[PDB]
Structures are given as C-alpha cells and as structure tokens.
Design a protein around this ligand. Structure first.
Ligand code: MG
Ligand code: MG
Ligand code: MG
Ligand code: MG
Ligand code: MG
Ligand code: MG
Ligand code: MG
Ligand code: MG
Ligand code: MG
Ligand code: MG
Ligand code: MG
Ligand code: MG
Ligand code: MG
Ligand code: MG
Ligand code: MG
Lengths: 203, 125, 58, 92, 87, 137, 142, 91, 34
RNA sequence: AUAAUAGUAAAGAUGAAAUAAUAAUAAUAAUUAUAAGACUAAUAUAUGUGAAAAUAUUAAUUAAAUAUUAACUGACAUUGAGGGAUUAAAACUAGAGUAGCGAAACGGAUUCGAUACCCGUGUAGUUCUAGUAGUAAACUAUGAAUACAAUUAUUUAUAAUAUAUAUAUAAAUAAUAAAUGAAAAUGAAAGUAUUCCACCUGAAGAGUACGUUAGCAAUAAUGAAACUCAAAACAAUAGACG
C-alpha cells in the first residue's frame, strides 16, 4: 500500500525530534540529522522536504525540526558542522578506546544510552600508519589554545614540560590567534557522550 | 483529628535557653493527653532569630526557640489548646493547622513531608 | 446479577483490606506515639536534653 | 553582657530590609544606581505614586486588567517580531 | 513556557526601528580626555597625544563621520507568520 | 456511643486484629495496651470530624431501609439518606443563622426529598406511607 | 558615657519640599542579656543639623524644585565639614522620590559632597508604604 | 588582556565550530538563557522560610508566575504557603 | 437607550425629584388626618 | 493623636496662592514610646468559586462543592404564572464606634460672576451588632433546558503509553468556516431545531396622576387617560470638527 511506501520513504527515515536548533548549552554530540542536497537540486531549491527552501540558502547541507509549521515556514538551520568534526577526528586518527577495562561494544528491554562511541569512530586501536618518512609514532595536529585547546573540531585537555612565557604572556587573551602544534596522546569517551581528548603542546 | 502546631517560645535565660520551651511542651502535651488526645511527635527547631523585633504584651523579642508538636485531638480541644497558647506570656507566636487524614492515617509533620518522608514509618526506618 | 453482586462485594473487600493495612501500619508506628505522662516526659528528654537533631536549615 | 558583646551585631545585618546596600568607596554612583534598580524591581516608587489618591475598586480593577492586556500584547508582538527576524535571516 | 498569540491585527510594525550604530570616535576621545583631566591636574603632558588626536578628529567638523529594513519584513511576512485560520 | 470508631472501623474487629498481630509477632504488655489506647483515641468518633459521624448515620439509614443488601437508590433509601443530611444541615443552620447559602442548600435538599416521596407515592403507595411513618413525616 | 558610633544622613524628598537631617548614633558603654542586645540593636540617635530647602532662602514654590534641593544638600555637606561630624562612618537613607532626591544624590556624587562620600558606609532607602490602611484622598479632577 | 564578556570559553568535553569563536555566537548565548517545580505541594514548606524566600523579591514581595515560571496551581499554593509563613513569626 | 436618549429620562427624573422636594410640606398636610 | 529626645526657622499647600486645631507658647523633618480605629502590598489573572448580589493577610470549626469507576433506582425529568428566599451603593431605626476619608455647612482661592472644578476646617455618612427596605449601566445591556454542526491554537483535568514521552478524551479561553444577521458582529450562540417562562407593539405626556398594597421613613411595586406631533430610533457610510 501507499502507507507502506510512506513508512519506507526518506522523510520517515529521518527520526523526528523537537530539540532546539539553537542550543547555547554544552554540545557533546550531534543533535539533528544533517541533510544534504546535490548541487542540481539546490539550484531548483529542492531538498526532498514538504516545501521549497529559500533561494537565500546557498549551502548544500542543513538541519530541520518541522516539515511545515503554523507560521508557514519549515523550521531549519542551514548548517552541517557535525560531519566536519567527525571527518577531522578521522583524519587525526586517534582511536577511541574505553579507559575502563571493558569489552568493545561493537563485538560480542532497550537501552537508550550511547553504545560505545556514538559512531564518530569505528576505527580499531591496534594499527600503525606508515608514510614515506616512516611509521608515525606521534600524531601531529595543529590547534588553538583558549586560555584547554581547540584541536580540529574538539576541545581537549593539554599538558606540557614547561609553560612557555614568550608566546603566552605576549598576548594573554589573544592566544586563539596563534595556531600551535599538538601531540594527541589518547581519546577517552565518557558516559555523557563527550570525547575527552588529551594533547601535548609542541615547540 | 491530626493537628500540627508551631509555637515560637520565649528565651529569657541566656545560658539555658530551651528550659521554658521544654516546660511549654510538657504542659501542652499533658493537656492533650488529659483530654483524649495523642501527641505523635515533638519536633524541635533551632534557636532562630525572628524576622522583626516581635512584641508580646509589655515585652519585646528578637530571638526565640521554635518547635512543632504533631498531635491528635478533638476540634474543641485544639481550640482550647490554641486559646491557652495565645494566653500564656512565654510564647511569641502560636499556630495550629490541620493535617488531613481523609486519604492516610500515618502523616508526618510538614517539615518531614517537605524533606521527603510522607509517613512517620519512613522517619522511623 | 451474579457478576454485579461480585463487583459490589469485591470493591468492599478491597476497601476493608486497605483499612486493615492502614490500621496495622498505625500499630507499627504507635510505639513512638504518646498517651501516658511518663512516655511524654521521655520524649521531651530525648528532644531537649540530648541537644541533637534540632531542625534548623543551612 | 558578655554574651551580648560576643554577638557582634549579627542580627543587625539580617534584620534590615532589602532596601539597603554596602557602598564600595571606589564608586558611590554605582551603588546608588544599583539601589535605584532594586527599587524599580520592587515597584516601590510606582506603589507610592498609586497610594497618593483613592481610586474606586472597580475602576482600579479595570485599570489592572487593561495593564495586563497591554503586557500580553507586547510579548505577543515580541514573539511575532522574533519569528519575522528568523524568517528574514533564513530567506523567507 | 507560556506562548502568547496575538489577535488579527491591521498591520504588524515597530514604530521606531533602532539601527544601533557604533558610538562616535571623536566623542570617545573627548570623554577619554575629560577622564584624564579628572586625574593629573588641569593639563599635564600625560594627555598630550590624546588632545592632538581629538583635534585631528574634530578639524573639519565637530563629529567625524556623518536605516534597518525591519518593518519591510514584518509587513511582508505578517500574513505568512500569522496563525490566522483559513478563509 | 462510647466505643464507636470513625473511618469505617468497628471496635470489636480492631481488638481482634490487634490480638492476631500480637500472635503473629509471638510466632515470629503495658506498652502494647498504651499503643492500643492511642489507636482507639486516633480512630474515635469524638476526636474525628462531624463528617465521619454523618457518613456513619447515612450508612445506618441505608442498612435500615434497603429492600435488598445492594440497596442504594431505592426511593425510600434515597429519602432516608436525604433526611440525615437535612437533620445535620438544620442543626448547622440553628448554630449559624445568617449563613444563607447553606439555608438555600437545605431548602433544595428538602424539596428534592419531597419530590422523591411524591414519586414513591405514585409508584408504590403503601411503601411510601411506611417510609413516611418511619421518617416521622 | 556617650560614644558616637556612626552618623545617619536622612533625606525626606516630598513633592513640594526636601528635608535633610544629620544625626549621631549615640551608644553608651554601660541587667538582662536580652535587654542589652535589644539596646544594641536600636541605639538612640541625636539630631545635629536639620535642614529644609526654605532655610536656604527658597520661598514657596521654588523650594519644590531640584536646584534648591541641590543647594540645600551642598549646605548640609558644608555644615558637616565645618561642625566636625566626619570622624566616624555615615549612613545615607531616603524617602518619597521627589525631584530633590535626584538632586541630593547628584550632589553627593560630585565635588560638593567630596569629603562626605569617603565616610559613607551604606546607602539604604526606607520609603513608607501601606498594605491597605487608611483611605487616601479622592483623586482631584482638575 | 581583555574582559570575560567578549570571549566564549568552550568547555572541556564539548564540540565547537568556527562560528563558535565569533562575536555573534557570544551575543546569541547572551540572548538565550527546582524543588517546587519537581512535583511537591509548596504548602509543606510553610515552616521552611529558607526555601520559600527563594520565591520572593529582596524586599519581601512574592514573585509573579511569569518570573517564577510555575504551574498556576503550584504557584498559588506557593503563594498561600508564603502568606501562612508571614502570618506566623517565621518569615 | 443611547446616552443622549437617557439624558432626557434623567432630566425628567430630576424634575420629578425637585417637584417632590417642593411639595413635601403640602404632601404632609394632605396625608395626615384624611 | 499624645508624650519625650535632641535640633533650627520656617512649615504645609498649589497651576500660582492663601485660609486653617501650622510655627519663636519652639513647629515641620528626624528618632523613640503609647493608644485608637479602620484597611489588607506583592502573589492576581476575579484565574477560579458562588444562584445572583458577591468573593483575594493567616488559622480553626460547621456546611456545600469536581472527575472516573462499581452498584442501585427505573423517567422520579424540563420549564415554571402565582408564591418564596437572597439581593451592591445610598437611605432609615436602635446601641456601640469614629483613625482616615467625606455629602452638607463655613472659610480661602479661581473667576466678569463661581451657590463649582482646586485648597482648609470638616458634621451626617463610611465601621461593627441587631433590624427595615428590596432597588442599580443588579450589564454578557444577550431568560432556562435539551439534541445537533466545520477547523486551528492555547492552557486545565482525566485515562492509557514504555516516572516523561507522544497519544486518545472532556472542559474552558482565543482566532475563524458554515449559518444567521439592518449591519456592527455572533461562532458552539445572535447558527440548525424542540420545550417552557418573562416581556414589546410610534413619539411625547409617563413609570407621571389617581387608586391600592407594603414600609419607621425616604420610597417600592401596581399603573392609566386627555392633550400634541409625523415623527421617533438603530447599524453603517463619507465628510467637517476636537
Ligand atoms: Mg427536583
Ligand atoms: Mg481632607
Ligand atoms: Mg432598548
Ligand atoms: Mg445563570
Ligand atoms: Mg492583593
Ligand atoms: Mg446609625
Ligand atoms: Mg472638600
Ligand atoms: Mg449603613
Ligand atoms: Mg428582609
Ligand atoms: Mg429607584
Ligand atoms: Mg434591564
Ligand atoms: Mg470573539
Ligand atoms: Mg434566522
Ligand atoms: Mg436580533
Ligand atoms: Mg413610584
């Protein structure tokens, strides 16, 4: 029947939620399903939703809550930043392992809690990564110090041998401007779904 | 009929403040039991300062000792007790208020209910 | 009719059971309750003389 | 006497009302502004102004209703304009 | 929370759309100078460059440099944004 | 009456229940007696509200009038139930003269009673007459 | 004994006139504990300089108007400075939200109340309101 | 050096975005910002001024349901409890 | 009744009241003893 | 309001001024300390609750009150002439009470005049207890009851859901469809229908006169005619005007 087709179809596939699109609180993982178009479909304003989406939007990705509201507008936000964070994490290549002595959940009524990682990493911890220069022991990643350090779409705890005064005290609260290199030690994941990275400042 | 009470007693003596309070509690409890009543709990509260300088007839008070007495009685009885409280010089403010027993039989004091313990069984345990 | 009689009686029985339970609970409690003078005096002593667990918030 | 001495004006701080603030010596003006704000929040000047004359109880009730309506309209307007702003931002 | 739906209105408009601009540079400099002169006596050379800067700013005119389409959007989008029931 | 209890209790039953509890405890004196006394005081009519007493009176009236055990709504039993309330309402009015809302309520209640007795008379006259005689009307 | 603990600057600012008042809180160093504590709580006051803006030669209507209030405040401050009640701390209080209240605070802020400010420990309003109470006059038609 | 109001401190475990460093983010954050709400009748707290004083202005006035943000019934119960409190000495 | 129409009625009522006030002593005389 | 403290020449009032139980008999402001009445800030939306008048400081007593289930009664219902009871404010009769307010009265202003609007003294009255009386724009200017009809958004309560979700119910409130309507607009009624009661039949004269009944009284109800007009009224329209 039609009903069966509807149940199958791509709008039914997007699991509904009425969480805020603007959430100024702490964001530990994606809230909403990111939805992309193709360039062609964007050109004729079609996203595979109830209505056309405004020609002002030139980004291919978005997030939404309601197909149509009482205000006669779809409730959306044109941004898909969460995919890029995931891709950055993948690039960094630091495999998430549970610091607590437990089996990997992907191997072997309902539990709504996050099964291992939320699916930002299905990488396994045992691999090395060779290159022309050699086998990479230390993962080199550029990040920004805030005061904690922003390292490729994630905030991370930082440690060092000696606190460098020349770089820090010259610009005390404009440290965000200057990008510093980092050596990421390991990535643990807590119950709330936050990725607790740990980096080391290189100079 | 379960009636809660709140009496804010006088504390004239500096070193031994609770004596007057204790005497009051004894007397009113005695009255209750003589007239078919059943005092369930006598919750003490601290030597708490009054919000304003509250005054009885030809006296003034800034600090008092507070307590709850959670007793059963007739209506008549409770009224008499209230009158006797109003009357005496060693209490600043008195307040009897009913605790409704249409649903339950065991009911703790208002403070205990606010904390969490609905019945006195919970308090005991 | 039989069904209706059962319905009438079952609810009454349940209510009776509840009342009995309540009574039992009251009885369990009632060691703390006071009727006599000596018990009242003991309670007073416990409350006041110990100088412990005065209900004050902070 | 000794007990009174020990109680070094402990009650004096808590007894006083909320219409009172300790001045910072660096900025008395700031303190005054804060006090004024507090008074505004408590609606004390407006209350004082209301209390100068008597207004018939039905008339004051009508006024109160009108004020309430005005309030509710304003936040309805605010809601509407926020939506309008969102629409503008998005493209609608 | 408590939502507040308005009735059908003739025209949704703000009567004075603020286009909150930045404050004037010359005015700021003048205030700074005033602040400096509150301290350090009348005219000490701690505020020697500040006065010069103020003069430079206020040479051609007393102020240096000399609207928000908001009620062009409300008017546009009122009929959409209404929860007005059908005809 | 002297050892009458509120909350749908009966003194004979309560004592028996207490004894059974004691026996169970033994399996698994002065103090116990004091507790029992406290319980009785709590559940006595005379410490309880007037409402409980009224309810008891209504129940008694129902028991008297019910043409079979399930009886509630028999025109006669309805009238009997009304009567107890009327008596109590009348007593309240006698205490409180200017309580006009509750006088109105009383009035309505006796009008309702009259109406149901009128109905009873039409339906089943002898029974109606008997009911009247019982109620003192 | 008579020890001055602190001064209190009172300012009643009505529609038509201001009343500025300076007063010393006089504690005696020299019975029941409760009574002593009560005495400590409410220390007796002695008035030092009373002032109303007509005292500064503002007649009839002009005394309801700011400038006059400001002048009165300045005069008060001068008196405080000269008469030598600046050794202990000061406590500012106000009443009735007149124009003159606005004047007084401005005067205190500025150079006219320069010497006083440094001793001013607390500002604390005490305007009187009524929770029902006596009925006010009928609202004038005009 | 710079003040705290013009720099968003991203928490430790959180994700961020390029936008999140901006002025506009900070403005957005600024724009967008209990036992009685938990589900217990406030008329238990009439001998607990400490807790009832939270639902009261500095002077002593009771706060409006727009401010306190309660269920209407629950608000009215709270108000009642407060009034009871001030009828007694305590509060 | 509009307000304008009511005003005629009001006026009439006032006139009547005035007449009654005037004829108080006369009314008294008429009433007693007959 | 009285008294004390210390303190100094104005204070209070208004559009601006004066008169007054204001003040060089030492006030006003301030700080205390007594007394007296009468009112009830926030919460508050009269939301809700009450038959309507009404009704928001606290407590207690007695009365009445919601929903859903179970059982019972078996049309016992609806409306309601006459009748009955309650019925704001003012008013009246007794006896207390009398702070504040405040008809009247007197005085000061304002004004050509000012029997006013503003200010000052301020008596009845407002307050309580016991009554009388039975009217108000007593208004939703809309009598009560039942069956029914298209949507949406808000809350409120009920049930299930696997306590916090998205669902089914009701209830109210706000926008409407249809329909009705002179239109304004009404919107589950001012719609579609059925039942019962009250009331209207041009404007003036008139809710007047006479009569009767009731009231301590003011008054309340009942309620005509002659005489005289072709008027009189409502919704909306466009102006002019403020
Ligand atoms: Mg009937
Ligand atoms: Mg007057
Ligand atoms: Mg008409
Ligand atoms: Mg009705
Ligand atoms: Mg109020
Ligand atoms: Mg009288
Ligand atoms: Mg007058
Ligand atoms: Mg009267
Ligand atoms: Mg009567
Ligand atoms: Mg009349
Ligand atoms: Mg009418
Ligand atoms: Mg409408
Ligand atoms: Mg029709
Ligand atoms: Mg019509
Ligand atoms: Mg007549």
């Amino acid at each position: 029947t039609l009903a069966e087709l509807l149940g199958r179809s791509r709008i039914a596939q997007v699991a509904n939620n009425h969480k805020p699109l603007t959430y100024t609180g702490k964001k530990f993982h994606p809230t909403h399903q990111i939805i992309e178009t193709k360039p062609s479909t964007l050109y004729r304003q079609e996203w595979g939703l109830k209505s056309a989406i405004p020609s002002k939007i030139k980004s291919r990705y978005l997030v939404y809550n309601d197909l149509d509201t009482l205000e006669r507008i779809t409730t959306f936000e044109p941004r898909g930043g969460t995919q890029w964070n995931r891709l950055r994490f993948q690039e960094m290549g630091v495999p998430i392992v549970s610091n607590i002595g437990r089996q990997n959940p992907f191997f072997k009524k309902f539990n709504t809690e996050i099964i291992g990682t939320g699916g930002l990493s299905y990488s396994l911890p045992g691999k090395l990564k060779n290159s022309p220069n050699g086998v990479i022991q230390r993962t080199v990643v550029p990040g920004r110090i805030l005061n904690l350090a922003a390292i490729g779409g994630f905030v991370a705890d930082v440690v060092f041998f000696q606190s460098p005064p020349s770089s820090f005290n010259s610009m005390g609260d404009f440290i965000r401007m200057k990008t510093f290199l980092f050596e990421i030690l390991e990535a643990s994941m807590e119950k709330n779904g936050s990725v607790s990275m740990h980096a080391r400042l290189l100079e | 009929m379960l009636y809660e009470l709140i009496g804010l007693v006088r504390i004239t003596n500096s070193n031994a403040p609770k004596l007057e309070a204790k005497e009051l509690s004894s007397t009113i409890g005695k009255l209750i039991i003589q007239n078919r009543g059943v005092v369930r709990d006598i919750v003490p509260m601290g030597i708490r300062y009054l919000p304003k300088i509250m005054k009885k007839d030809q006296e003034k008070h800034f600090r008092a000792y507070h307590f709850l007495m959670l007793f059963d009685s007739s209506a008549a009885v409770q009224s008499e007790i209230l009158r006797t409280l109003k009357k005496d010089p060693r209490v600043i403010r008195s307040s009897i208020v009913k605790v409704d027993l249409d649903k339950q039989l065991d009911r703790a004091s208002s403070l205990h209910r606010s904390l969490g313990k609905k019945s006195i069984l919970e308090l005991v345990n | 009719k039989l069904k209706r009689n059962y319905n009438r009686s079952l609810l009454n029985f349940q209510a009776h059971k509840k009342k009995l339970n309540e009574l039992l609970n009251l009885y369990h409690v009632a060691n703390e309750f006071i009727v006599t003078e000596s018990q009242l005096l003991k309670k007073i002593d416990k409350v006041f003389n110990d100088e412990t667990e005065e209900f004050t918030d902070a | 006497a000794e007990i009174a001495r020990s109680s070094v004006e402990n009650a004096q701080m808590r007894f006083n009302s909320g219409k009172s603030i300790i001045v910072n010596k660096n900025n008395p003006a700031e303190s005054f502004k804060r006090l004024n704000r507090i008074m505004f929040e408590n609606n004390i000047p407006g209350d004082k102004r209301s209390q100068r004359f008597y207004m018939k109880p039905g008339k004051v009730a009508e006024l109160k209703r009108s004020q309430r309506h005005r309030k509710e309209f304003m936040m309805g307007f605010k809601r509407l304009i926020e939506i309008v702003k969102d629409a503008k931002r998005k493209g609608y | 929370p408590p939502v507040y739906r308005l009735p059908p209105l003739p025209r949704l408009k703000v009567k004075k759309p603020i286009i909150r601009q930045e404050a004037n540079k010359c005015l700021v400099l003048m205030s700074n100078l005033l602040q400096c002169w509150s301290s350090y006596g009348h005219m000490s050379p701690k505020c020697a460059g500040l006065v010069t800067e103020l003069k430079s700013c206020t040479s051609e005119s007393a102020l240096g440099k000399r609207k928000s389409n908001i009620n062009y959007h409300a008017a546009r989008l009122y009929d959409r944004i209404n929860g007005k029931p059908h005809d | 009456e002297p050892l009458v209890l509120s909350k749908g209790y009966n003194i004979e039953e309560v004592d028996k229940f207490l004894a059974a509890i004691e026996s169970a405890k033994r399996e698994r004196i002065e103090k116990l007696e004091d507790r029992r006394e406290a319980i009785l005081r709590i559940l006595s009519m005379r410490n309880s509200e007037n409402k409980n007493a009224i309810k008891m009176a209504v129940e008694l009236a129902r028991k008297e009038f019910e043409r079979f055990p399930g009886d509630t709504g028999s025109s006669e039993v309805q009238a009997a139930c009304m009567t107890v309330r009327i008596q109590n309402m009348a007593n309240h009015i006698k205490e409180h003269r200017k309580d006009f809302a509750n006088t109105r309520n009383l009035r309505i209640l006796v009008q309702q009673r009259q109406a149901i007795l009128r109905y009873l008379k039409r339906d089943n006259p002898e029974k109606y007459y008997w009911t009247i005689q019982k109620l003192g009307l | 004994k008579e020890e001055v603990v602190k001064y209190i600057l009172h300012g009643k600012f009505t529609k038509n006139n201001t009343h500025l008042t300076f007063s010393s809180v006089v504690e005696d160093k020299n019975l029941t504990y409760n009574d002593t504590m009560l005495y400590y709580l409410n220390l007796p006051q002695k008035v030092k300089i009373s002032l109303s803006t007509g005292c500064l030669g503002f007649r009839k209507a002009a005394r309801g108007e700011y400038e006059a209030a400001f002048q009165t405040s300045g005069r008060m401050f001068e008196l405080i400075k000269e008469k030598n009640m600046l050794n202990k701390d000061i406590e500012v209080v106000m009443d009735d939200f007149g124009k003159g209240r606005a004047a007084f605070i401005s005067a205190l802020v500025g150079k006219e109340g320069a010497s006083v400010v440094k001793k001013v420990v607390k500002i604390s309003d005490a305007t009187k309101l009524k929770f029902g109470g006596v009925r006010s006059p009928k609202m004038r038609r005009l | 050096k710079i003040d705290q109001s013009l720099s968003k401190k991203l928490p430790k475990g959180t994700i961020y975005d390029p936008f999140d460093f901006s002025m506009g983010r900070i403005h957005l954050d600024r724009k967008y910002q209990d036992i009685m709400k938990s589900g217990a009748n406030p008329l238990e707290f009439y001998a607990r001024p400490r807790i009832l004083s939270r639902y009261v202005t500095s002077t002593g006035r009771i706060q409006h349901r727009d401010i306190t943000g309660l269920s209407a019934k629950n608000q009215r119960r709270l108000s009642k409890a407060i009034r009871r409190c001030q009828a007694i000495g305590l509060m | 009744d509009s307000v304008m129409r009511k005003r005629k009625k009001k006026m009439k009522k006032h006139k009547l009241r005035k007449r009654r006030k005037r004829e108080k002593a006369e009314r008294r005389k008429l009433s007693q003893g007959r």
